[PDB]
Structures are given as C-alpha cells and as structure tokens.
Amino acid sequence: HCGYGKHNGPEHWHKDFPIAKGERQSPVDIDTHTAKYDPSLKPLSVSYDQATSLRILNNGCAFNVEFDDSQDKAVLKGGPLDGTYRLIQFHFHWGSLDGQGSEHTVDKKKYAAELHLVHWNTKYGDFGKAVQQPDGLAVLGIFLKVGSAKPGLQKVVDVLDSIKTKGKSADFTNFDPRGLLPESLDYWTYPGSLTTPPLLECVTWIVLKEPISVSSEQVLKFRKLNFNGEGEPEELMVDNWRPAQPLKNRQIKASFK
Ligand SMILES: [Zn+2]
C-alpha cells in the first residue's frame, strides 16, 4: 500500500521495494550546466499518427490513458533508442500548488506537473517482460507550466468527472496524443526507473526541454480527482510525485547545444 501521504509516501517505499535506494532511480534533477551535448544522438521520431486510445482509468495513484499496443500503431524510435518502442499509456504527476508537481526538476526548478508517455521495447514481446529489462521502456517526459490553456488536453480534463475515484474507468477512444507535445523535441536523456512501485530500473528517460502550457482551470480539475475509492473519505489526488533521487554513477545527455 505505497502511496503519497505522510505515512506511506516516497520516503517509506524502500521498505517494500528495496530498489528504491538503487543505482539508477528516477526522477532526478537535471542540471543544465552539467548535462553534456551528445553529437551521437540520432534524431527523435515520435510516430503517433495511428494511435488508438481505448480507455482512461483512475488507478488510485494517477489516471492512465491506455492505448492499443497489440501492433506498431504509435511508436517512439531514434534518439538514444535502439529499435522500436510502443506506446501503451500516458499519465501525469501534479501538485497541490502551481509551484510543485513535476518529478524531474531543471536546475532544481519544479513545474506544475509532468506528463509521462510510456513505451515498451517490442523486442521483448510484451510490457510485463519489458519491465524486467534494463532497456525495456522508454518514457517521454513533458513538463507542464500554468499559463495559456492547452487545447489538446481538454478532452482529458472533461472526462475526469467520470473517473473521480480509484477503480473507475471510462471509454476514451479517438484521442490524439500529438496534441500534448511542445513545438521542440529537444531533450535530455539518462537511464533510470519507474517513479512508482515497483520502481523497476528499466527506463530510458527522454525529457523534453520545452514545457507545454496548461491553464489554471485545467490543472485545477486534475486536483479534483480522488486517491480513494467511491464512498470512502475523500482524499484529493494531489502531490502524486516522487522527489528527485541521487544521480549516482550517471551522466545526463542533451540532444541540443
Ligand atoms: Zn509517471
């Protein structure tokens, strides 16, 4: 029962998941002055044209927008990656206040939220096998700041009322995740982990430098979700983020100068 409260938050997770104190945990602070431009990084390729979204689920920790990954319909390639990674879901982490909510930080700056587009390496055949491998997943991370509304986010915001509590799901077809990307695909990359239990060290992180802007009203609706199940005492789904973890023996590489 790991979670985000005082008694079961991130600082407690290591008791159930000893890898929480491992050598390649995420998120991390991205020190922009220490990251190294890597001329070898090939360009990043986000091919979401045939993306097939299916459902949106409140899983008690965030909400997940799930995709049909039974075929290469929406994939991530290039950049630091070898091979083809299939989109399986995206989710966010966000704060109680506009000054916090992101998992990664940039020169210790926290953003209001962070989008994770989760992809698995097709050479491992399924998601469950992929998470057991050091190069199993590629997660595209996108910062959110509060400013102008993001039109491509609004279809998500408007369905949240129907998945308020843990375990609720709703149909979420014909959603285009391209609407959540910033203009630039300049990124930072490093090897890390899932940022929730089981905290598996199976992720190539690709974090976009350019944030997207969402409106105050949009993030406010995120904060009206619930960690709890229906008919339970209400605990707002806020501050579902893990703080920065020790970089240890890792170098963050930049795709840009
Ligand atoms: Zn995440």
Curated annotation (Swiss-Prot):
InterPro entries from the UniProt entry: CA_dom, CA_dom_sf, Carbonic_anhydrase_a-class, Carbonic_anhydrase_a-class_CS
Residues that, per the record, bind substrate: 195-196
Subcellular localization, as worded in the UniProt entry: Cytoplasm; Cell membrane
Outcome following mutation: residue 59 to A: Reduced activity
Enzyme active site: 61 (proton donor/acceptor)
Sequence positions that bind Zn(2+): 91, 93, 116
Stated pH dependence: Optimum pH is 6-8.
Cofactor: Zn(2+); Co(2+)
Swiss-Prot/TrEMBL catalytic activity: hydrogencarbonate + H(+) = CO2 + H2O; urea = cyanamide + H2O
Result of changing residue 59 to D: Strongly reduced activity
Subunit record text: Interacts with SLC4A4. Interaction with SLC4A7 regulates SLC4A7 transporter activity. Interacts with SLC26A6 isoform 4 (via C-terminus cytoplasmic domain).
Site-annotated residues for Fine-tunes the proton-transfer properties of H-64: 4, 59, 64
Effect in UniProt of substituting residue 116 to E: Strongly reduced activity
Any one cellular-component term (Gene Ontology): extracellular exosome
EC id: 4.2.1.1, 4.2.1.69
Highest taxon above the source species: Eukaryota
Impact upon substituting residue 64 to Q: 2-fold decrease in enzyme efficiency, as determined by kcat/KM ratio, and efficiently inhibited by chlorzolamide
Protein name according to UniProt: Carbonic anhydrase 2
Remaining remarks: Target of drugs used in treatments against glaucoma disorder and breast cancer.
Effect ascribed to mutating residue 15 to E: In Jogjakarta
Function comment: Catalyzes the reversible hydration of carbon dioxide. Can also hydrate cyanamide to urea. Stimulates the chloride-bicarbonate exchange activity of SLC26A6. Essential for bone resorption and osteoclast differentiation. Involved in the regulation of fluid secretion into the anterior chamber of the eye. Contributes to intracellular pH regulation in the duodenal upper villous epithelium during proton-coupled peptide absorption.
Residue stretches making up the Alpha-carbonic anhydrase domain: 1-256
GO-annotated biological processes: angiotensin-activated signaling pathway; carbon dioxide transport; morphogenesis of an epithelium; neuron cellular homeostasis; positive regulation of cellular pH reduction; positive regulation of dipeptide transmembrane transport; positive regulation of synaptic transmission, GABAergic; regulation of chloride transport
